[PDB]
Design a protein around this ligand. Structure first.
Ligand SMILES: *[C@@H]1O[C@H](CO)[C@@H](O)[C@H](O)[C@H]1NC(C)=O
Ligand SMILES: *[C@@H]1O[C@H](CO)[C@@H](O)[C@H](O)[C@H]1NC(C)=O
Ligand SMILES: *[C@@H]1O[C@H](CO)[C@@H](O)[C@H](O)[C@H]1NC(C)=O
Ligand SMILES: *[C@@H]1O[C@H](CO)[C@@H](O)[C@H](O)[C@H]1NC(C)=O
Ligand SMILES: *[C@@H]1O[C@H](CO)[C@@H](O)[C@H](O)[C@H]1NC(C)=O
Ligand SMILES: *[C@@H]1O[C@H](CO)[C@@H](O)[C@H](O)[C@H]1NC(C)=O
Ligand SMILES: *[C@@H]1O[C@H](CO)[C@@H](O)[C@H](O)[C@H]1NC(C)=O
Ligand SMILES: *[C@@H]1O[C@H](CO)[C@@H](O)[C@H](O)[C@H]1NC(C)=O
Ligand SMILES: *[C@@H]1O[C@H](CO)[C@@H](O)[C@H](O)[C@H]1NC(C)=O
Ligand SMILES: *[C@@H]1O[C@H](CO)[C@@H](O)[C@H](O)[C@H]1NC(C)=O
Ligand SMILES: *[C@@H]1O[C@H](CO)[C@@H](O)[C@H](O)[C@H]1NC(C)=O
Ligand SMILES: *[C@@H]1O[C@H](CO)[C@@H](O)[C@H](O)[C@H]1NC(C)=O
Lengths: 491, 491, 491
């Protein structure tokens, strides 16, 4: 009056953390983990400890040629990725085109070493006019000027003698060389400037075999010239030579560029500050330190990154559903300060809670392992997501978009369902575990005690603290009390 | 002789609906849902309430230029996608080429507004022959004729004077302009037609800088001309001007086209009728109203669509395995007219079936939630799947094919396995639920009744209808009958 | 002293095979299956019973034109895929270019029929020099020579008369035709060789309309010529004709090629021997006979193949966790020589183990079905993974790489997690099965026997071998022993 007791129960707490399973929405849970990265540092940072290349209002074109209003960061021998604005103000001062422009950007996205040199001195032009080739389309100190890396040759007295110049790459490294042809308005401008009326430029390497001829049209004024400049480029292998020849209309090299190229990258489209940080994932809205296997920031990322997923929350249940002294069948015990599953005894030496170290370790190690698998099994490659196509490559641009949207639709769907199914699995694990511990006890006692129905057993004998620890240890000796039990039963 | 009874059991029905799980094939089930869309309305319909553009035997080329045998639907100011046949009969009446043809189709796939206008009246040609430029390759009323949107200029008396024409876009909207060059057979035809023996066309905008020169070859007759026409096009920004100049061989604009462009789409390859319907998914074999997250019709779709999957059936088990008065251990009760899990009592006031509202709601809400997750978690973007590459882009066409086949192989595999694993999960849920309800009862009664082994309990006392409702309610008072039970037991 | 007994238990064995589940790492198991193909036969073999095309040191270019040092396998009328080395020694003997080279390789990757013919006899050149067009860049028997499939025409006496040649395809099959233009160094070489100082080649079909003009530059010596040859090609529809015309610099066809084309394939980059085998998956490190739905060899594969996955082991648990005579609660019985789950009785006729045929069949059929689903549900299409882009298509090459790496990242991740989750499912199945068999018995006996707690029941009466077989058969008659039991109990 009354007899000794032991109850099986589980942990609870004041946690309000909610989770979704394939079957139940908004399920309050004990503790849970988010696997979606949502947080960016709002800045552009190094990549594997290498600065970017941030063109403030210039453009790879304007930058290369020397657009005089491109007052930028001149000296910088290497970079990881490149950063243009949306529509950079300063591009081509004198209007025209850049042969294979995009393919060049892509090549310049990631440079190991980059040193500008001088292949044809501006002073070497003894029999042509080097310092007259100047326009009001390219203002400097309020005076007319021109691209500073490349020379507009004019006729001397009234003579454009044929130009023949070879240059030989005697550096250790490939050379990026740049020249151009002036397409003038009419045969007046043509001969006023180059005299000879039928001109041409031939350019030759061991690869190249060029022969450009000025085109005439009536064209609309752009920065007030109806003239057009069209530039070209080659890479000069490290012991080859380039040979120029020109009747006129020649925009000569002054400075070329030594490059060492080690794998690609891409141009990024951002309005952000450098932040002097490092990172391994750069986004056009900030960087990331991704432990997380998913993120939802911006799709146009560079580096080893989490998969981009259209979603706000991916939360994994790690703990339990969250809700005499009645056992598990009437809810969880707040008084289980430590341990996930365990007991509550009450005998003549007194009542306590007592955690199940063994079954609570398997449970934790299991859930820790689940969360870590879902993360460390994620194959993370270096990738650079850019927008590399002009507006006569809209078919190829549209093939790129189906691929990105296609991979988004797959990752966004499989992450959602993986959380929903693997949560339902985690909460049915917690149930299956509590109920297995009841039966661990129930099977040991048998008739030496009675199932009360609330998740406790009342004993048919004296169970002191030392008897309880045999029940929890799973070492309960029944023939040792089978008799004492038998008597208090029959009655 | 005999005692009062209560049995736990489950629903059954005459349903023959079958399902597959990861382990069991052909499993008869109570009721199940198909998640594969297989049904199309065999017609071409609007998209987001916008008509297509159905070219009956013409082609974007033939359509644009005015191939006289292209007796089509002239007036139509906007469209969503475009529809060619396989090999349209009427294309280029006079043989030749269309510069950047594919890139133009892609641009014209989706037009917000499209109004043809007249930039150069056919009557403005005072000093050249506008009405002689006619071929038997382009028959109309059985007479020789030519593309009606573009003019074949010939010499007057025996003089082709130089043409200089500027046109200025003074409309609000971009302009698609079209011209061409006649490549004739020999220097006889050349001068018979344009007189001057060395001709050229220059075309200039703020973008463009063209200079075409007729090519001569000996070429095979095609519609009986060994001549060739080669056409070109530009988009004229809304306050820019285009300037033409020509010694001869010029196919002049008459009519250009105002366009407003708002995102792309694609050309579709169908033999189908317009059906005056709306839709958000169009296929080349009909449209779809996709609640369903998968479909198996045709891969070349346009709109927000289900993922295309190579499969015939994706069926989700929603109900139960389908098979005194014996409880669950001997099968399901047909007599459970309503409810999934429940009881069958039999006492001195009589025998009935009685559904478990509470446990049967959790079950339904759970399964309803599962099916809805598998559907509403599907990220559905607008996409247009076309065939946009010529037969010198077979490498890029082959890159598109690996991507489509690649995404098919992923979706087809993950849908199959998701149904197989999530079915097995649903039927083990139904088992785990029945068996939990047995133990809900079994734990309440204890020795006040006896487990018969068939899934019933026989009572060791009088259980009237009101006692039964405490067992079903889970409010069964045991000390209230513990004594009356104890006596009828001992004996 | 003592009573008759029956125990429920499971199989064990000396197996050390380990497996990972979402929760437990390194779990010793009874037997398990690997689903990753890792084994290749180190050789290049047929595909669907068709030989490849293995160019030992030549290149599609060098091969086609007849580079004299391309001592290869001449006669071969059909092939499946093509095999170059990394940087083939013999390519273009005389330096220059091949118009649309890559697009041609792609076309020649898979040829149904391929017969070389002669369209323009070398002897037909009555008024030009056919046998003087020879260089020291193209040595043969230590003498100067030239591409053997194509003719270098020189002037006769001191006259290059105009060439006009039509050829008409009167074969059943399309024709691949090849010609070229000599770009010489200076106007001296030009007229020394072709006499006329301003030359041209026109080429015309019903498709083509060509007019090439030699270019001059000062170019670097390559195999000691600063000259350059530039070749071109067309496909001649089977009843069309090609017409050549040339003032000079013409490299004439001698031999063209009949082709029948049936779907594409790709060029492969291998250093391997032909092995006279067949296969349906060829890799650049050997072939595969893929039952397996995954492999980890090399990504650049050709045929119907397993998905390429970055992983070393994908192992599926098929058997059980691996560890009176105590029942299941104390471990597995080595003495269960046959059967997965079953019994161990002990009575007055003696003790034995006895397998549960019925429950052990469901288990095997279930696991066999799981492994087969995970394999036979894998959609396997024919695909050819190559490297088809030059180094001015690096943007398109980079779009191909994101797609491959993208599909790798998906398959590698989903296979890892599918094994981890579906293993945990398989071992919880084995538990749920043992424990259901205990309760199958426990429910049949009731008070006619006592739960010992170790997973056995001790009988409260005589159970001979025939009584045991009713318990295993599930046909145990309790009213038949309810009395005999009742007496031996009360006491
Ligand atoms: C879930 O919880 C939030 C409250 O934070 C609520 O906005 C939402 O409507 C709830 N219900 C469902 C069905 O998601
Ligand atoms: C140009 O050069 C000088 C002027 O300093 C003069 O002697 C020479 O004659 C000039 N040439 C011509 C052809 O006018
Ligand atoms: C460039 O100079 C080096 C060193 O004298 C020489 O060997 C090389 O051949 C020159 N370049 C060319 C293309 O001749
Ligand atoms: C488990 O509990 C008993 C009693 O408290 C204790 O003596 C011992 O540490 C454990 N039993 C065994 C066999 O180790
Ligand atoms: C499943 O059921 C259908 C009968 O509708 C039958 O054709 C098929 O062969 C059955 N068996 C299996 C193993 O799929
Ligand atoms: C062409 O124009 C008129 C014919 O009406 C004639 O007066 C004129 O002389 C002609 N020109 C020539 C050069 O024949
Ligand atoms: C077209 O006309 C407008 C209005 O007069 C004018 O401002 C514009 O400059 C003209 N176009 C060009 C390219 O000049
Ligand atoms: C459940 O059943 C009892 C008896 O039928 C009824 O009085 C009551 O509605 C329920 N019990 C409680 C505590 O509400
Ligand atoms: C698993 O087993 C292998 C021994 O074959 C061992 O190398 C590895 O470190 C073990 N442990 C884990 C956690 O993987
Ligand atoms: C070239 O051909 C023969 C030489 O056999 C000679 O009769 C003829 O005059 C030569 N022609 C010229 C223009 O030298
Ligand atoms: C080639 O010869 C056939 C047979 O005589 C002829 O019909 C065909 O028209 C010729 N080719 C061309 C392009 O005329
Ligand atoms: C199962 O076992 C019994 C007793 O061994 C045997 O007679 C019979 O084959 C089975 N029972 C039935 C009803 O078939």
């Amino acid at each position: 009056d009354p007899g000794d007791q032991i109850c099986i129960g589980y942990h609870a707490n004041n946690s309000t953390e909610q989770v979704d399973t394939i079957m139940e929405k908004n399920v309050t849970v004990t503790h849970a983990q988010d696997i979606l990265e949502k947080k960016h540092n709002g800045k552009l940072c190094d990549l594997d400890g290498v600065k970017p290349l941030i063109l403030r209002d210039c453009s790879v074109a304007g930058w290369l040629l020397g657009n005089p209003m491109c007052d930028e960061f001149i000296n910088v021998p290497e970079w990881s990725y490149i950063v243009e604005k949306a529509n950079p103000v300063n591009d081509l001062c004198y209007p025209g085109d850049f042969n294979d422009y995009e393919e060049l950007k892509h090549l310049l996205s990631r440079i190991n070493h980059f040193e500008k040199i001088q292949i044809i001195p501006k002073s070497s032009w003894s029999s042509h006019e080097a310092s007259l080739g100047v326009s009001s389309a390219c203002p400097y100190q309020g005076k007319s000027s021109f691209f500073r890396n490349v020379v507009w040759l004019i006729k001397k007295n009234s003579t454009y003698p044929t130009i023949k110049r070879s240059y030989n790459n005697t550096n250790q490294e490939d050379l990026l060389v740049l020249w151009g042809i002036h397409h003038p308005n009419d045969a007046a401008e043509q001969t006023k400037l180059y005299q000879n009326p039928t001109t041409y430029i031939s350019v030759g390497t061991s690869t190249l075999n060029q022969r450009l001829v000025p085109r005439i049209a009536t064209r609309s004024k752009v920065n007030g010239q109806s003239g057009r400049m069209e530039f070209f480029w080659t890479i000069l292998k490290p012991n080859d030579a380039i040979n120029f020849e020109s009747n006129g209309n020649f925009i000569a090299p002054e400075y070329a560029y030594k490059i060492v190229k080690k794998g690609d990258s891409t141009i990024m489209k951002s309005e952000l500050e450098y932040g002097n940080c490092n990172t391994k994932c750069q986004t056009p809205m900030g960087a990331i330190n991704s432990s997380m296997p998913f993120h939802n920031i911006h799709p146009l990322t560079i580096g080893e990154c989490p998969k981009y997923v259209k979603s706000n929350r991916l939360v994994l249940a790690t703990g339990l559903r969250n809700s005499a002294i009645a056992g598990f069948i009437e809810g969880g015990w707040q008084g289980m300060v430590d341990g996930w599953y365990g007991y509550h005894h009450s005998n003549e030496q007194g009542s306590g809670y007592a955690a199940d170290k063994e079954s609570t370790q398997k449970a934790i190690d299991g859930v820790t392992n689940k969360v870590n698998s879902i993360i460390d099994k994620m194959n993370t490659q270096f990738e650079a997501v850019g927008r590399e196509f002009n507006n006569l490559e809209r078919r190829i641009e549209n093939l790129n978009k189906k691929m990105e949207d296609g991979f988004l639709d797959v990752w966004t769907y499989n992450a959602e369902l993986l959380v929903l199914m693997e949560n339902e699995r985690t909460l049915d694990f917690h149930d299956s575990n509590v109920k297995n511990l009841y039966d661990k006890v129930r099977l040991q006692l048998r008739d030496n005690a009675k199932e009360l129905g609330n998740g406790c057993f009342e004993f048919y004998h004296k169970c002191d603290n030392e008897c309880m620890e045999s029940v929890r240890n799973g070492t309960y000796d029944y023939p040792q009390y089978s008799e004492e039990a038998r008597l208090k039963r029959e009655e």
